[PDB]
Amino acid sequence: SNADDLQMIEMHELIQEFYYYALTKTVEGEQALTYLQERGFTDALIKERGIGFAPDSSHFCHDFLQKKGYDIELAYEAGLLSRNEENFSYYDRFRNRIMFPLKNAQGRIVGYSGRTYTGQEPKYLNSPETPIFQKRKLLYNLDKARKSIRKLDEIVLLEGFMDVIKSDTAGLKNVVATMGTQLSDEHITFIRKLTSNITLMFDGDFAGSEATLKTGQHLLQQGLNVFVIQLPSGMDPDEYIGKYGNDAFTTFVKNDKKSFAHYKVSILKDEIAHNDLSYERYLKELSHDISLMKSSILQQKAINDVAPFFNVSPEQLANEI
Ligand SMILES: Nc1nc2c(ncn2[C@@H]2O[C@H](COP(=O)(O)OP(=O)(O)OP(=O)(O)O)[C@@H](OP(=O)(O)OP(=O)(O)O)[C@H]2O)c(=O)[nH]1
Ligand SMILES: [Mn+2]
Ligand SMILES: [Mn+2]
Ligand SMILES: [Mn+2]
């Protein structure tokens, strides 16, 4: 029910104040606080994002929600507590982790991501699927980013929320991320209503490139204008900002932004030039990709940009399309 949903949100927003105090003021939170500060988190940013710490007692959240008069079983359903199936007892789902509030599109806290700071597994522990937290629908930072996305007529998708937090601080405000999932049909439906331009900036490794190609292809099929920013090898936005600074980052992002077709053929460059079988297959693929582009202006430029990779003229490629 909507009433139960509201209680679940309340639980999240009330415990947030407690997590925040635990992180910034208490003895047990000291090491977690140092970890964040060494990663460049100022006290202002921690306060701004409402970042906190979950103690290791296993009944910190439980006792708090109990004292406030919340139904314990509902707290379990809200994904704040876990349940011992043998004894049917309840305990904290989040223990000894740095707590990042996950807000819905309306800016209400509906879940948490808890990061280890002592090399534990998993590195990031998210809320499970609940009536108020659904990974296929939630986009991290969307609540804050919406205004700039509409103003700039562009959304930038990163791999993880940590990169979003850093990028936002650096001056790139139209950024979001999924909670460790592939971009869903629901997400795409949400995004489409805000803008027709989406830029993918995943990590600069093999997995990021593969994800760029898969996500990009799907977005293209859905009729969106897809762009790609390619980070230096082995780097993500958080690492770039930490190494080169804020101004260097926002300049980099503004510099090399390629249409998806151009990015795709540049990745396939060597195979195309050496494998005649791949040459023919990718010529057909890129032709199809370019045909999907809704922008007549960008379509024509993609033709000019892609043709040299196949050693054909723009006119010949246009004919193939
Ligand atoms: N041992 C362990 N590693 C994890 C876990 N979760 C994520 N990682 C790895 O941490 C690396 C980067 O994490 P990300 O998902 O990119 O998020 P981050 O913003 O980098 O978090 P962070 O800054 O480290 O706190 C990746 O290495 P790759 O580049 O090889 O990933 P891949 O197979 O994609 O090449 C992940 O595989 C985990 O639960 N356990
Ligand atoms: Mn990676
Ligand atoms: Mn990363
Ligand atoms: Mn990282």
Coordinates of C-alpha atoms and ligand atoms in Angstrom, one line a residue:
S1 CA 0.0 0.0 0.0
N2 CA 0.9 3.7 -0.4
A3 CA 0.8 4.0 3.4
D4 CA 3.3 1.2 3.9
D5 CA 5.5 2.6 1.2
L6 CA 5.5 5.9 3.0
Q7 CA 6.5 4.2 6.3
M8 CA 9.4 2.5 4.5
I9 CA 10.6 5.8 3.2
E10 CA 10.3 7.3 6.7
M11 CA 12.5 4.5 8.1
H12 CA 15.1 5.2 5.5
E13 CA 15.1 9.0 6.0
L14 CA 15.2 8.7 9.8
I15 CA 18.0 6.2 10.0
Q16 CA 20.0 8.4 7.6
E17 CA 20.4 11.0 10.3
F18 CA 21.7 8.3 12.6
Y19 CA 24.2 6.9 10.0
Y20 CA 25.4 10.4 9.4
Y21 CA 26.1 11.1 13.1
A22 CA 27.8 7.7 13.4
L23 CA 30.1 8.5 10.5
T24 CA 31.1 12.1 11.3
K25 CA 31.0 12.1 15.1
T26 CA 31.4 8.7 16.7
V27 CA 34.6 6.8 17.6
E28 CA 33.5 3.7 15.6
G29 CA 33.0 5.8 12.5
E30 CA 36.5 7.3 12.6
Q31 CA 38.2 4.9 10.2
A32 CA 35.4 5.1 7.6
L33 CA 35.5 8.9 7.8
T34 CA 39.3 8.9 7.2
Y35 CA 38.8 6.6 4.2
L36 CA 36.3 9.0 2.6
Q37 CA 38.5 12.0 3.3
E38 CA 41.5 10.3 1.7
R39 CA 39.3 9.7 -1.4
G40 CA 38.7 13.4 -1.6
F41 CA 35.4 13.7 0.2
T42 CA 35.3 17.0 2.0
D43 CA 33.1 17.4 5.1
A44 CA 30.8 19.6 2.9
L45 CA 30.3 16.9 0.3
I46 CA 29.7 14.2 2.9
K47 CA 27.0 16.5 4.5
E48 CA 25.6 17.3 1.0
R49 CA 25.2 13.7 0.0
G50 CA 24.1 12.7 3.5
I51 CA 26.7 9.9 3.6
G52 CA 26.9 7.8 6.8
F53 CA 28.3 4.8 8.5
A54 CA 26.5 1.6 9.7
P55 CA 28.1 0.2 12.9
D56 CA 29.1 -3.5 13.1
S57 CA 26.8 -4.4 16.1
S58 CA 24.1 -6.0 13.9
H59 CA 21.3 -4.4 15.9
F60 CA 22.0 -0.7 15.5
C61 CA 19.2 -0.1 12.8
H62 CA 17.0 -2.8 14.4
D63 CA 17.0 -1.2 17.8
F64 CA 16.5 2.3 16.4
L65 CA 13.5 1.4 14.2
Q66 CA 12.1 -0.6 17.2
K67 CA 12.4 2.4 19.5
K68 CA 10.6 4.6 17.0
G69 CA 7.7 2.2 16.9
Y70 CA 8.1 0.8 13.4
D71 CA 6.9 -2.8 12.6
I72 CA 10.1 -4.9 12.4
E73 CA 8.7 -7.2 9.7
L74 CA 8.0 -4.1 7.6
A75 CA 11.6 -2.9 8.1
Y76 CA 12.7 -6.3 6.7
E77 CA 10.4 -5.8 3.7
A78 CA 11.9 -2.3 3.4
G79 CA 15.3 -4.0 3.0
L80 CA 16.9 -2.5 6.1
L81 CA 16.9 -5.7 8.1
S82 CA 17.8 -9.3 7.3
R83 CA 16.1 -12.4 8.7
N84 CA 17.7 -15.6 10.2
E85 CA 15.5 -18.3 8.6
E86 CA 16.3 -20.9 11.3
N87 CA 15.2 -18.8 14.3
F88 CA 13.2 -16.1 12.5
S89 CA 15.1 -13.4 14.2
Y90 CA 15.9 -10.0 12.6
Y91 CA 19.2 -8.2 12.4
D92 CA 20.9 -5.3 10.4
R93 CA 21.5 -6.0 6.7
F94 CA 24.1 -3.2 6.6
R95 CA 27.1 -3.8 9.0
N96 CA 30.4 -2.0 9.1
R97 CA 29.8 -0.1 5.8
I98 CA 29.8 3.4 4.5
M99 CA 26.2 4.3 3.7
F100 CA 25.2 6.1 0.5
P101 CA 21.6 7.1 0.4
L102 CA 19.8 6.1 -2.8
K103 CA 17.1 8.6 -3.7
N104 CA 14.2 8.1 -6.1
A105 CA 13.2 10.6 -8.8
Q106 CA 11.3 12.6 -6.2
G107 CA 14.4 12.9 -4.0
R108 CA 13.1 10.5 -1.3
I109 CA 15.5 8.0 0.2
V110 CA 14.3 4.6 -0.8
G111 CA 17.4 2.5 -0.3
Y112 CA 21.1 2.4 0.5
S113 CA 24.4 1.3 -1.0
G114 CA 26.9 0.2 1.6
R115 CA 30.5 0.2 0.7
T116 CA 33.2 -1.8 2.5
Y117 CA 36.2 0.2 3.6
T118 CA 38.2 -2.9 4.8
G119 CA 38.3 -4.9 1.6
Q120 CA 35.2 -7.1 2.5
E121 CA 32.9 -8.9 0.1
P122 CA 30.9 -7.7 -1.6
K123 CA 32.5 -4.3 -2.1
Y124 CA 29.2 -2.6 -2.5
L125 CA 26.0 -4.0 -0.9
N126 CA 22.8 -2.5 -2.1
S127 CA 19.2 -2.7 -0.7
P128 CA 17.3 -5.7 -2.1
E129 CA 14.3 -5.2 -4.4
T130 CA 11.5 -3.6 -2.3
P131 CA 8.1 -1.9 -3.0
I132 CA 10.0 1.4 -3.0
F133 CA 13.4 0.4 -4.4
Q134 CA 13.6 -1.2 -7.9
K135 CA 16.9 -1.2 -9.7
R136 CA 15.3 -1.3 -13.2
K137 CA 13.6 2.0 -12.4
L138 CA 16.0 4.0 -10.2
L139 CA 18.8 6.2 -11.7
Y140 CA 21.2 7.5 -9.1
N141 CA 21.3 11.3 -9.0
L142 CA 18.4 11.8 -11.3
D143 CA 16.6 13.9 -8.7
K144 CA 19.5 16.4 -8.7
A145 CA 20.4 16.0 -12.4
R146 CA 17.0 16.5 -13.9
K147 CA 17.2 20.3 -14.2
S148 CA 20.6 20.3 -15.9
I149 CA 19.7 17.4 -18.2
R150 CA 16.7 19.4 -19.6
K151 CA 18.7 22.6 -19.7
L152 CA 21.7 21.1 -21.5
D153 CA 19.5 18.7 -23.5
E154 CA 21.8 15.8 -22.7
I155 CA 22.2 13.1 -20.1
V156 CA 25.5 11.5 -19.3
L157 CA 25.5 7.9 -18.1
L158 CA 28.4 6.6 -15.9
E159 CA 29.1 3.0 -14.6
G160 CA 28.6 3.7 -10.9
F161 CA 27.3 6.2 -8.5
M162 CA 30.7 7.0 -7.0
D163 CA 31.7 8.4 -10.4
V164 CA 28.5 10.4 -10.5
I165 CA 29.2 12.0 -7.1
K166 CA 32.7 13.0 -8.2
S167 CA 31.7 14.2 -11.6
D168 CA 28.9 16.3 -10.1
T169 CA 31.3 18.0 -7.7
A170 CA 33.7 18.7 -10.5
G171 CA 31.0 20.6 -12.4
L172 CA 29.4 18.0 -14.7
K173 CA 25.8 18.1 -13.3
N174 CA 23.8 16.1 -15.9
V175 CA 25.1 12.7 -14.8
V176 CA 23.4 9.6 -13.5
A177 CA 24.1 5.9 -13.1
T178 CA 22.2 2.6 -12.6
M179 CA 22.7 0.7 -9.4
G180 CA 25.1 -1.8 -11.0
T181 CA 22.6 -3.1 -13.6
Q182 CA 22.3 -2.9 -17.4
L183 CA 20.2 0.1 -18.5
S184 CA 16.6 -1.1 -18.6
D185 CA 13.7 -0.5 -20.9
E186 CA 12.1 1.4 -18.1
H187 CA 15.2 3.6 -17.7
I188 CA 15.2 4.3 -21.4
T189 CA 11.5 5.3 -21.3
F190 CA 12.3 7.7 -18.4
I191 CA 15.3 9.2 -20.1
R192 CA 13.6 9.6 -23.5
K193 CA 11.1 12.0 -21.9
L194 CA 13.9 14.2 -20.6
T195 CA 16.2 14.3 -23.7
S196 CA 17.0 12.5 -26.9
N197 CA 20.8 12.9 -26.4
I198 CA 22.7 10.4 -24.2
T199 CA 26.4 10.3 -23.8
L200 CA 28.0 7.1 -22.4
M201 CA 31.1 7.5 -20.3
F202 CA 31.9 4.1 -18.9
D203 CA 35.3 3.0 -17.4
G204 CA 38.3 2.9 -19.8
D205 CA 38.7 -0.8 -19.9
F206 CA 37.5 -3.8 -21.9
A207 CA 34.4 -4.3 -19.8
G208 CA 33.5 -0.7 -20.2
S209 CA 33.9 -0.8 -24.0
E210 CA 31.8 -4.0 -24.3
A211 CA 29.1 -2.3 -22.1
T212 CA 29.3 0.8 -24.2
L213 CA 28.8 -1.2 -27.4
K214 CA 25.9 -3.2 -26.0
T215 CA 24.1 -0.3 -24.2
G216 CA 24.8 2.1 -27.1
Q217 CA 23.4 -0.3 -29.7
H218 CA 20.2 -0.7 -27.7
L219 CA 19.8 3.0 -27.2
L220 CA 20.4 3.6 -30.9
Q221 CA 17.7 1.0 -31.8
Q222 CA 15.4 2.9 -29.5
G223 CA 15.8 6.1 -31.5
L224 CA 18.1 8.1 -29.3
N225 CA 21.1 10.1 -30.3
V226 CA 24.0 8.2 -28.8
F227 CA 27.5 9.7 -28.0
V228 CA 30.6 8.2 -26.4
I229 CA 33.3 9.7 -24.3
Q230 CA 36.4 7.4 -24.2
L231 CA 38.4 7.7 -21.0
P232 CA 42.2 6.9 -20.9
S233 CA 43.0 3.3 -20.4
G234 CA 42.2 1.8 -17.0
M235 CA 40.5 5.0 -15.8
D236 CA 37.1 6.0 -14.6
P237 CA 35.8 9.6 -13.9
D238 CA 36.7 9.4 -10.3
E239 CA 40.3 8.4 -11.2
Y240 CA 40.6 11.1 -13.9
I241 CA 39.4 13.8 -11.6
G242 CA 41.8 12.7 -8.9
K243 CA 44.8 12.7 -11.2
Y244 CA 44.2 15.7 -13.5
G245 CA 41.7 17.8 -11.5
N246 CA 38.3 19.4 -12.0
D247 CA 39.0 21.8 -14.9
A248 CA 40.9 19.1 -16.8
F249 CA 37.9 16.7 -16.4
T250 CA 35.2 19.1 -17.6
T251 CA 37.4 20.1 -20.5
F252 CA 38.1 16.5 -21.5
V253 CA 34.4 15.6 -21.4
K254 CA 33.7 18.6 -23.7
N255 CA 36.5 17.7 -26.1
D256 CA 36.1 14.3 -27.7
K257 CA 32.5 13.3 -27.9
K258 CA 31.9 10.9 -30.8
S259 CA 28.6 9.6 -32.3
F260 CA 28.1 6.0 -31.5
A261 CA 28.7 4.7 -35.1
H262 CA 32.0 6.6 -35.2
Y263 CA 33.1 5.2 -31.8
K264 CA 32.1 1.6 -32.9
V265 CA 34.0 1.6 -36.1
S266 CA 37.1 3.0 -34.4
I267 CA 37.0 0.1 -31.9
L268 CA 36.7 -2.4 -34.9
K269 CA 39.4 -0.6 -36.9
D270 CA 42.1 -3.3 -36.9
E271 CA 39.9 -6.3 -37.4
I272 CA 38.2 -4.6 -40.4
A273 CA 41.6 -3.8 -42.0
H274 CA 42.9 -7.4 -41.6
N275 CA 39.9 -9.7 -41.7
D276 CA 37.9 -9.6 -44.9
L277 CA 35.1 -11.6 -43.4
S278 CA 34.8 -9.1 -40.6
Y279 CA 35.1 -6.3 -43.2
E280 CA 32.0 -7.3 -45.0
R281 CA 30.0 -8.0 -41.8
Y282 CA 30.9 -4.8 -40.1
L283 CA 30.2 -2.7 -43.3
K284 CA 26.7 -4.1 -43.2
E285 CA 26.4 -3.5 -39.4
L286 CA 27.6 0.1 -39.6
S287 CA 25.4 0.7 -42.5
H288 CA 22.4 -0.5 -40.4
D289 CA 23.6 1.5 -37.4
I290 CA 23.8 4.7 -39.5
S291 CA 20.3 4.1 -40.9
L292 CA 18.9 4.0 -37.4
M293 CA 20.2 7.6 -36.6
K294 CA 17.2 10.0 -36.4
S295 CA 19.3 13.1 -36.7
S296 CA 19.8 13.9 -40.4
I297 CA 22.8 16.1 -39.6
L298 CA 24.6 13.6 -37.5
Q299 CA 23.7 10.8 -39.9
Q300 CA 25.5 12.6 -42.7
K301 CA 28.6 13.3 -40.5
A302 CA 28.7 9.6 -39.4
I303 CA 28.8 8.6 -43.1
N304 CA 31.8 10.9 -43.7
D305 CA 33.5 9.7 -40.5
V306 CA 32.9 6.0 -41.0
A307 CA 33.7 5.6 -44.7
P308 CA 37.5 6.0 -44.4
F309 CA 37.6 3.0 -42.1
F310 CA 36.4 0.8 -45.0
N311 CA 38.4 2.6 -47.7
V312 CA 35.3 3.6 -49.5
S313 CA 33.9 7.0 -50.4
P314 CA 31.1 8.7 -48.4
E315 CA 29.0 8.3 -51.5
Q316 CA 29.6 4.6 -51.7
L317 CA 28.7 4.2 -48.0
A318 CA 25.6 6.3 -48.4
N319 CA 24.5 3.9 -51.2
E320 CA 25.0 0.9 -49.0
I321 CA 22.7 2.5 -46.5
Ligands
LIG1 N1 36.9 -8.5 -5.2 C1 35.7 -7.7 -5.6 N2 35.8 -6.7 -6.6 C2 34.8 -6.0 -7.0 C3 33.5 -6.1 -6.3 N3 32.6 -5.2 -6.9 C4 33.3 -4.5 -7.9 N4 34.6 -4.9 -7.9 C5 35.6 -4.4 -8.9 O1 36.1 -3.1 -8.5 C6 36.4 -2.6 -9.8 C7 35.8 -1.3 -10.0 O2 34.5 -1.2 -9.4 P1 33.4 -0.4 -10.1 O3 32.2 -1.4 -10.4 O4 33.9 0.1 -11.5 O5 32.9 0.8 -9.2 P2 33.9 1.8 -8.6 O6 33.4 3.3 -8.8 O7 35.3 1.7 -9.3 O8 34.1 1.5 -7.1 P3 35.4 1.9 -6.3 O9 36.0 3.3 -6.7 O10 36.5 0.8 -6.4 O11 34.9 2.1 -4.8 C8 36.1 -3.6 -10.9 O12 37.3 -4.2 -11.3 P4 37.3 -4.6 -12.9 O13 37.9 -3.3 -13.6 O14 38.3 -5.8 -13.1 O15 35.9 -4.9 -13.4 P5 35.5 -5.1 -14.8 O16 35.1 -6.6 -15.1 O17 34.3 -4.2 -15.2 O18 36.7 -4.8 -15.8 C9 35.1 -4.5 -10.3 O19 35.2 -5.7 -10.8 C10 33.4 -7.1 -5.3 O20 32.2 -7.3 -4.6 N5 34.5 -7.8 -4.9
MN2 MN 35.9 -2.1 -15.0
MN3 MN 35.2 2.2 -11.7
MN4 MN 36.4 3.8 -9.1

